[model samples]
Target: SKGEELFTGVVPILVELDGDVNGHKFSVRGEGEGDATNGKLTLKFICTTGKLPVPWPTLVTTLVLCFARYPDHMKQHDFFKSAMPEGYVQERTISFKDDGYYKTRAEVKFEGDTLVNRIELKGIDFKEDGNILGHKLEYNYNSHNAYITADKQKNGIKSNFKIRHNVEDGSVQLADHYQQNTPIGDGPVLLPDNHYLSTQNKLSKDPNEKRDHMVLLEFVTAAGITL
Candidate 1:
């Protein structure tokens, strides 16, 4: 239970994406109670596991595992919402070798005192290639969808785009115009003040691990995600 997995340790934090950009309001915020609505917001929260070997798995698996750890740790992050099923599971054949698979199985439930109402999103995946950090998400709850991503790529500053989708006949239509914003100024300031993660600590504990924690954090956060 402790060291069986490649990593351990879980951090808890709150994610609030409420604002209007280009007529689009992310408004994806839900209280501890359920009752939810559909909106687009990029969130990043740090996920620190116990510890493991250096030279981790492939790039994709490494990237996704960080996300998989969320529901595992945040089932109670909110009182209104709860994570059902479970989080991702990684199967490794050997140390830093190919032929391993990243098992996915995570979902979030919104109930209690939520804005929209009681509802849930199951079978969520970290989209790769298509959207910003696969910021495009899917679910088993409703067919509704939204898209948001970092607009510019730079070292110190930050900005992102958000698109609203409308359903016509059958297929979903992505909004032509998007809402964008520059939230930070001069240098990236990741890891919000309330976040309880320290992947950086692990790096020095074993920099040779080449854990790539810093870049990984930037990759997710830059795209408006926190974990």
Candidate 2:
């Protein structure tokens, strides 16, 4: 009877995209829902400016939607790897976009009720030329809690971010920072207080509205999926 049952539903999401890119100031508010099973994602935004860059919407949707699935993605990867024969390499090539692909290698370990996943992504074009990116993601899953630290590098820019999500309550907290030429330390690092982009926070009025650099927004999702 369970096998005969069919299920269908969509996950509703609210996203705020705030922050500056290269000297441009943008603050966008949007709400939309996505159905992963049906491969559909959509959003409607109220923005401070009318003509935003073409990449803005795409980038926001890609990051939020992919992040929603990351927990299950890691779980599935681990499950499949455990079923494989001993000594088999546990790795996968996951593509985030048509031109954006990463070779993912992972080391998964368990302690008590926690599962820790250390993952690395090496960006590769088909030819594997010089254009590249590197990512180190550490994910800790403790029953219903998921914590992630994503450190990224491309060209000469290095960025780091942390995500804290609770599956039971469907709460998410995220902070991101970017620096040039500085190696992110292994110890605890401090990020801007306003870097949080989740429902638990609110957007404060910008003291310098005329400045053309910095973004801030609050994103919330409901009933659709766990972050």
Candidate 3:
């Protein structure tokens, strides 16, 4: 007798980014999960700050966008297409630490089609003491509007910023409390606009900038067995 096979259960995705940036060590660990036959995927990752000399906003921003854009990146792979369904929603939570200074957490919810529909900064702990302030982030296909606030003052001043992104216009902007709107960039390429986020393998102009990156996808049975 012969039996047919059904693909069902969790697919684990592991990603790592390690390298030297501005004479500081950069490392990230990403973990993601999805159903073997469904398109919905969830990711939660953390960036280690043990060696970072300062908080690199561009680094954090780029990393968030990298994972945010991953579903589309995976679509180019024949294996991913065969294993997962289409038009599914995905969610991701990312954490960044500035070593002894501050920590930030962002939660992103998006669809395979829109890429990034909504994002929220859960908190930014300035003191690294567990007390945090959160912001409400909003975005639409045609326009963007979002703000950040704090419960109390930190270092005699409140921190606030406005985040804006327009999918149709292909633009992203960030405004500081000083009311200056800085254009991060347009389209998939972002500030620092390096090849780090490129889906295709490309060589960088600076050889020392080469990063140690790895991605792994594994399938496991719903019955707690690895296959």
Candidate 4:
């Protein structure tokens, strides 16, 4: 009962992120079997379309954490809670042009308390940071999927910076996050619903140093998520 309900909720919400509502079609459903004592539910998110969002991988992880910088991990951490899906699954990664889409051809499994015995994640990362080298900047899934099995725990360095995700969608979207050498180093570079990460450095050529000719503040709000 619960798994079915969760499946109904998770799929459409995530699938919608593709912004390919009517044109593409795919079936997403989960099944569970267990005596009153033998209980298990498996959940899966599928995409049949050939495209991802404007910002790939933004649905689950980035979108959710897009608000992480907010002051509510206390109340907002429940998605971290359970009644979610579990099981084993295979993963796949496909690269298009210069970008890549990481998918898991998975077999969901169930876990009781930790949900550790849940889905098996296998993803590939294309972008690299200080830790790995080749930059474009990314954690690349399979390389860090273990945390899904480790409860809410996470891997420290995907290469150089830490990767954070959205608990609801299993999306890991933030990248190039650092403390010692990167922007907004202490905790969240840009605090959620609080501070702003607006970069404005005034270096003018004219003697008066005109104030109007400068770039506007680029905003990456942490209202819901930030790595």
Output the number of the lDDT-best candidate: 2
Candidate 1 residue lDDT tens string, 1-227: 21112222222223232222222222222222111111112222221332211121111112211222223333222111111112212221111111121222222211221122111111112233322222222211122122322223421111122222222234332322222222222323222112221111011122453322221221111111345
> lDDT for every model?
0.22, 0.29, 0.27, 0.24
| Candidate 4: stretches off by over 4 Å | 4-103, 107-109, 117-133, 138-227
lDDT digits (tens) for residues 1-227 of candidate 4:
13323322222112112222112222322121211111111223333343222222322221111111112332232221122343222232323223333332322223342222112222244333311122222312312221111222221111122234222345333433211111111222221122222111111122452321211111121122344
For model 3, the stretches where C-alpha displacement exceeds 4 angstroms are 1-7, 51-227
TM-score per candidate, chains pooled: 0.20, 0.27, 0.26, 0.20
Clashes of 1: 23
- RMSD to true structure for each model, in Å: 20.3, 18.8, 19.0, 21.5
Better of 1 and 2 by lDDT: 2
Lowest lDDT block of 10, candidate 4: 212-221
Ranking by lDDT: 2, 3, 4, 1
- RMSD in Å for candidate 3, one decimal? 19.0
Residue 107 lDDT in model 3?
27
| Backbone collision tally, model 4 | 32
Q: Determine which window of 10 residues in candidate 1 has minimal summed lDDT.
A: 31-40
How well does model 4 score by local distance difference test? Answer: 0.24
- Which stretches of model 1 miss by more than 4 angstroms? 1-9, 17-154, 157-168, 176-227
